[PDB]
Structure formats: structure tokens, C-alpha cells
Design a protein around this nucleic acid. Structure first.
Lengths: 130, 52
RNA sequence: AACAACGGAUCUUGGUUCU
RNA sequence: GCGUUGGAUUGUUCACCCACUAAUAGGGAGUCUGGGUUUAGACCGUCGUGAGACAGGUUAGUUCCUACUGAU
RNA sequence: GCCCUGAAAAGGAUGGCGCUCAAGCGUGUUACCUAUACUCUACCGUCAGGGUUAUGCCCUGACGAGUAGGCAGGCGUGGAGGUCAGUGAGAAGCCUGACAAGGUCGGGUCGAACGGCCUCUAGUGAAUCAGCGGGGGAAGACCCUGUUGAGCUUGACUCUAGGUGGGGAGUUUGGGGGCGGCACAUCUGUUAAACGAUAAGCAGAUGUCCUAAGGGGGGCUCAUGGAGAACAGAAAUCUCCAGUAGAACAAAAGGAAAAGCCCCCUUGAUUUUGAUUUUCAGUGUGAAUACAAACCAUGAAAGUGUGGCCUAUCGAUCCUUUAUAGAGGUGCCAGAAAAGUUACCACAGGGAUAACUGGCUUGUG
RNA sequence: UUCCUGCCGAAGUUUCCCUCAGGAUAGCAGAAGCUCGUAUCAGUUUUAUGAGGUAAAGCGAACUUUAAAUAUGUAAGAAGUCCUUGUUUGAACGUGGACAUUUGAAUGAAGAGCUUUUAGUGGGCCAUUUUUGGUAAGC
């Protein structure tokens, strides 16, 4: 049912519409297509751009923009859809912490795994993979 | 026919050599790239994937 | 339970087939 | 235990405003009226080579058996 | 070990009455109820073991539930052959007191033919009257299945000297995307090129880390001749010279303090995106290819690479030399079935329910 | 959409499936069937072994011998074995015959194996005995 079906037309017999009931991040390049093409619908209310990030070091959580999603297991078609689907690995702008790798090349982005379930909570939590 | 028949068009175009990919509705109007698009207007398998 | 209007089933020169 | 009133939208009333009072409490058990839930007939645009149906939408609409109150 | 707080609301659950040294609870012992259970006795049917000058009878023991289904036998009923030298001026029929399909007799009616048995056959089995209207007359709604029938458009299949040739007709319109992966020390059948050495593959007990590449780093030089070296000799071992390097430099070619051997490490199918494509919410790439600049190994350092190769099912006898067999190859064919539509559609049902898993909800991530 | 008595007596599992659909198919039980009434069958116990080696004997606080039941298949004889070699000091297919039924542990006592085929039943409802993957809890 997570691919919730929405009935279309005055006579509800040709819905053909699927709605994703899971948190999804898209960014600037969303650009909703004409309504006729909305095979999959990700509601705006269920879209989050900043996810909580933490590491077992100083216990400091800072909200950071979500950069992208690289690998979602369990049919990574969800990865292509950009859904959160707790257990995914996503990139986060870690510029705030300012950690610098060897060689003086300051790092500002690392991949983090979502720890909490955004479907059952209004906040997104992740742990830096450091 | 004769030209109206799709068999003649397929023979002329040579697609008969690779007719295994014959898509349901292969015609001059709305070829496979369009038939498949329109078919989407006609997700619940409930599969249990291993999210490892 | 028995008596009385009612009713029409079982026990009727009819049909079928055959030369 | 006894009370919980009255106006208002519709360019949807999945709700907000303020007259007066001491307050104008929250629900279920559905049960006359209006949107609408359905085939009426049509239109604008979407989509298609076309029948055809919609991402919208407008118009038309029709749906004594038992129990209680009085009496012989 | 108990009781109390430990959450429940829009005639229920110890069954109801009720109960408090309980008639509440844990535990030890006495008397009794009872099921179609258990033991015995008799009755109805089956089997088996035996007797009986017999498909009949007798003696003994166990069995008997039950849907679909099968098996072995009886009653009634339409008609007929035979038989009772049958029944009746009071026969057939109806209803009713008596002695498992069913049969018989007395009694209230009756007026014209009707039975018993062995067989054949088949159209045979208190109580009412006057009023509002909570519940149960439109019965079909309707998710979908029939391929039952058509309503239709077309470069859908089939037809209508060469050509247009649904303008016309018959028909359907089934029940599916990634995958292949190993290299050396070995011996065996083919290969074997036939004085041979024995190579350039097929499949095999065989492993092994070379992480399916050996990349780097540090060292060694080698087939074969002589002197030789207990067994050991012409091939086992141990030292001096050289193959211009018949080692492997995969190799084909005018040709190294290594590119051959030995000791350590070891990912690589890593990340963004500057040329090419392709969707299905055209998705700042979601991605391999092209390349960019980091990352890594390694070393003391200069340094070098490490980051992929490649490919549509299936035919193999739908190809052949074959008229009783062995296969060399889709770059040689042709497709699995010939497209949709119908709230103009008509009919019959698999069919969610008002809102109850295992009490299913409550104020604090 | 049809009278009666008695007996037997089930199925919901299994293979082909490009597949809901559709097909039989092995199995469940009564039968013509005669070959053995067997020293023949068993949802079973036991004797010897591989494993649950669950740790409590350890004699090796080093380590692997190895102690309980935790339920498994196999041999548990009737021509099986043997005297004898018919045939190419050592190998095997061994005619002929013998031990003939305490004949090879105990327990249940004759319905066991048919080459073959008959109508129905097609992947049913629940709980427990194992552990696998759970995550609020169901499962």
C-alpha cells in the first residue's frame, strides 16, 4: 500500500496512479511535470531537505542539507526515486564540522546512513560513516 | 493490402529478422516507444526483499 | 372425532401405431 | 441534578468570526433537508491515426408483519 | 502467596440466584452422580472355525460410527406368460382401530370386475378497535470474472498481365531483462607434425594463494659442456667459467642489477562530471562508455599502475555431405498469437460491511 | 430432477506449468487377478556403528579420548553358508549335493509383494513438537 493508489476521473475505474507514502528528497531539480504524467506522486508535505546528523564524537547534532542518495538496498529503484527508506546511505553537507583529511584537503561531504524511521517520525536522523 | 498489410512493411524494413522483439501493437502510428508509454495509463507485489 | 355446501383423484364408445 | 443560545460564508462551510449569558463542555445510538454518491443529454480543453476516457470542470437528476401512544 | 492503583463509555459475561472460619484460593484423605466408555446377560445383521444324505440347518468367537463413492440383497409400481380348475351382486376405491421399502383384517360410503405366487419387461420410486413510525416494498447497486454476443477505428491476420484494393466481410486482442566468468607444479585417451623430443587444447581425483593482475619494493641468474660430488649410475646432490643472453622477455618482429625466479603488501566493479543515449512525474544525472583531478599500493625517494572484459532468448535434425547418423553454424530464414475499444453494452455470480485478533485506543519523540 | 436393508469406505498431498486460467498425473480404499501361506511382514523395542559430542566423569590445570539418550539407515540367514572347482602356490561366474528348518536376538500372527485397473478426491481449517528470518506487537 505504500504505493497508495489515488482514484482518477469522475468515474473511479481507471486510477493507474501510484503515490509514494515515504519521505523523499529531490532538491531544486524537481520541476513537476504536467499532471497527466504523474505516474508516481511524492507529496510536498512529505519532502525533507535537512536531516539530523551525528557521530559518536562530542555528541553534537547539526541540521545539514541533504546532498544526494547513492545506494538504497531492497530494489534500489527506490534509490532512483530518492526515497529515504531508513537503512539507506545518503550524502550530507558536513561543511559545518570542517573535518580535514590528510593532505590539507578540507572535507565538506560524507555519506551517512539514516538511523531513525522518517515514515513514523517527523524528523530524520543519520550517523556519519566516519 | 498489399502495402497496408503490416507483414509487407515488416518484410521491407527487415525487422522480420528480429521479430522476437515484436511489441504488442507494432504499427506505423504509435510505435513501441509510444505503445509502452500509453500502456502505463492502464506496485503491489508485496515482495519481501532482503535489505542488506 | 362424526354430520353438511365445496371441490375432482383412483376405479370411461377415446388416441397412437401397425397391414 | 439542571442548562450548553443567535447571526455569518459557496469564488466546498475536512472551518473561522461575536451579539448576550454564569457557561454558551466532548462524544455514540443513528435517525426531515441540502451537496452528492451512478447509467439520462450536451459542452470547453486534455490524450490518440480513431473509436474511446479523462489532470480539471460546467449543465440535467427519481427514488396493516413487529414495537410504542389511547380505548373496549 | 494474596487484596488494592496498575484505564474504561456511549443487557454484559462467575451462566442466573447468590457467597465471606466461602459456596473465594493452594494442598492431603474420605462417600457418590453420571458417556452410546468399561465388565456381564438376552435380541437383530456380517465374517471365520467345524458338523450335518448342503444356495438349507446347527455349535462356537469377534464385530455394528460416518459424507462422496462402490459392493451384496429386498418392497412397491405400467404391461405380459404360467400357476392357485383364485376372488365377487358383493369386487376396485376413500378415512379410520388392530397384527425396513411395505402387507393383512373389522368398521361409516359405495357399485363392476379384481387378487396370491414363479418369471419376463420398461415412459416404473382471554381477545379486539383508533393513531406516530425505530425494524424487514426500487433489488438492483457493484470490485471483477465469462472469451457468451456485438458497438466501432485502423499500415492488426485472412481475401476482395501489374496496381489501389476494412470501401466490404470472418477473427482475435496470450497466461516474461538482464548474464559469462580463475592461473599456475602435475599425470592420463586424442591431438602426435609419425627415426623423435614432445609442443600449440579438449575433461579429469590434484591446490592455493596470484585478493581471478602480479603492480610495486629488495635481491638471484639462466638450457647445456668439462672437473667432478656415499649409495647416486646417462637423468636425485654440489662448486668454478659461459650461453648476447633456445629461459621467458605471453608472442608474431629489424630485437636486464630484468620484462624470467625468489621474500613483504595489496584493492580497484571508489568518488564529482566537463563530449555521446534514454525515460516515464526529462528526474542537475539514475548509468557504462570518453576523459578530467583526487584516493590507494609501494619505496628511504625518484617513480609505475589500480580501478574492468564482453554479450539478445531457442534452434544445433528449421543446413548440410545421409538413406540408415558425427557434427563443424543464426554474420543463413522466422516468429512464440492477428492492435484497442463497450456506464449504448445484456445476462449469472468469487464479493470488502456500518465499526472487535490474542480487549484490540488514551500525557509525555 | 425420484423406494428400502446390510457391508466396505476415502480425499484434500505429489509431476509436468514461460501461466490466475485449463489438463491428466503419483497417493488415499473396496475389487477379476492365485504365483508364496510364507520362515514371511512391522509408523516398534534391542543388540554394532556416524551424529544432537548438549560437559557434569578426563586420568592426555594442555586437551581427546569418550560417558548419558537426542532419533537415524543399514546385516539380524533357508539354497544364507559350505563339500566339490565345471574354466582361465594366489583370484574369480562355481554344475552336482550337504547343514532342512532353536534355521541364527526377543515382541505382535497369517490379509504380506502383485506385472495389471476401478469412481470420487486437487495443492483445507486449526493446535502442538524443532528452529530459521523477525520488530513495538502480529508474523
Amino acid at each position: 500500500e505504500m504505493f497508495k493508489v489515488i482514484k482518477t476521473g469522475k468515474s473511479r475505474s481507471k486510477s493507474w496512479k501510484r503515490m509514494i507514502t515515504k519521505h523523499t528528497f529531490v532538491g531544486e531539480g524537481f520541476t513537476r511535470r504536467p499532471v497527466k504524467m504523474e505516474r508516481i506522486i511524492r507529496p510536498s508535505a512529505l519532502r525533507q531537505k535537512k536531516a539530523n546528523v551525528t557521530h559518536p564524537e562530542l555528541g553534537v547534532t547539526v541540521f545539514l542539507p541533504i546532498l544526494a542518495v547513492k545506494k538504497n538496498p531492497q530494489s534500489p529503484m527506490y534509490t532512483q526515486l530518492g526515497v529515504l527508506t531508513k537503512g539507506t546511505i545518503i550524502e550530507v553537507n558536513v561543511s559545518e564540522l570542517g573535518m580535514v583529511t590528510a593532505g590539507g584537503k578540507v572535507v565538506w561531504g560524507k555519506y551517512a546512513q539514516v538511523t531513525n524511521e522518517p515514515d513514523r517520525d517527523g524528523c530524520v536522523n543519520a550517523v556519519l560513516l566516519v | 493490402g498489399t502495402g497496408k498489410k503490416e507483414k509487407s512493411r515488416r518484410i521491407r524494413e527487415g525487422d522480420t529478422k528480429d521479430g522476437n522483439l515484436r511489441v504488442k501493437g507494432e504499427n506505423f502510428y504509435r510505435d513501441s516507444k509510444r505503445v509502452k508509454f500509453l500502456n502505463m495509463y492502464t506496485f503491489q507485489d508485496s515482495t519481501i526483499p532482503d535489505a542488506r
